[PDB]
Design a protein around this ligand. Structure first.
Ligand code: KGQ
Lengths: 100, 100
């Protein structure tokens, strides 16, 4: 699909049996999910930086994400983000481009 | 142009005679510029929220921004952001879409 930007670009996403809306975020290197997200497995501690400073996150590798039905696999970060965010690591896998 | 997302989507912008690179940022409602940007005129205090918390910014209305040569006008926020950010308030004015 082609999506305009008068509304926040939320899509429905399915990760490990859970459903959620997430922001298609061209300004984000990495994908980050809300703190209530429960993902199984090992993870490595990491910290992510943004507007307002830094925040601590769990890094989960090789997670299957279904974004508008497209299946993608990549690293997902979990932590106290205000919004589920799909970053360029996953956006590249769905052939996402900016057009203007 | 059509732009892929294997690299951060920076464009060259020109704002009140100054040049800078700014991130085309679909996850941003608002446009924000680095703390050293000098904009003339009055402004109103505002605070912006993100990953890591909140930050204080100056809100300047009706600023002329030249983005890849498109002329647009909108509210620009200035404050201690780690990256110049073009948000959907200006992205909609350059006919910017997401495509996948
Ligand atoms: C305190 C709660 O306030 P909030 O209003 C903010 O909810 C957010 C937060 C962050 C983002 C993504 C970033 N946009 C954003 O900050 O926008 C600002 C300006 O406009 C406003 O729109 C909502 C957020 C304001 C931006 O697109 C991505 N990076 C920021 C910047 C460095 C580009 S990032 O999120 O810090 C990031 C992601 C992945 C990374 O990989 C390592 C690194 C960094 C979206 C929504 O809650 C709403 C319910």
């Amino acid at each position: 699909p082609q999506i305009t930007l008068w509304q926040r670009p939320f899509v429905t996403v399915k990760i490990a049996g859970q459903l959620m809306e997430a922001l298609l975020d061209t300004g984000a290197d990495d994908t980050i999910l809300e703190e209530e997200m429960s993902l199984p497995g090992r993870w490595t501690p990491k910290v992510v930086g943004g507007i307002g400073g830094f925040m601590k996150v769990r890094q989960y590798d090789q997670i299957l994400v279904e974004i508008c039905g497209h299946k993608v696999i990549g690293t997902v970060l979990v932590g106290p983000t205000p919004a589920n965010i799909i970053g360029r690591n996953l956006l590249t896998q769905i052939g996402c481009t900016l057009n203007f």
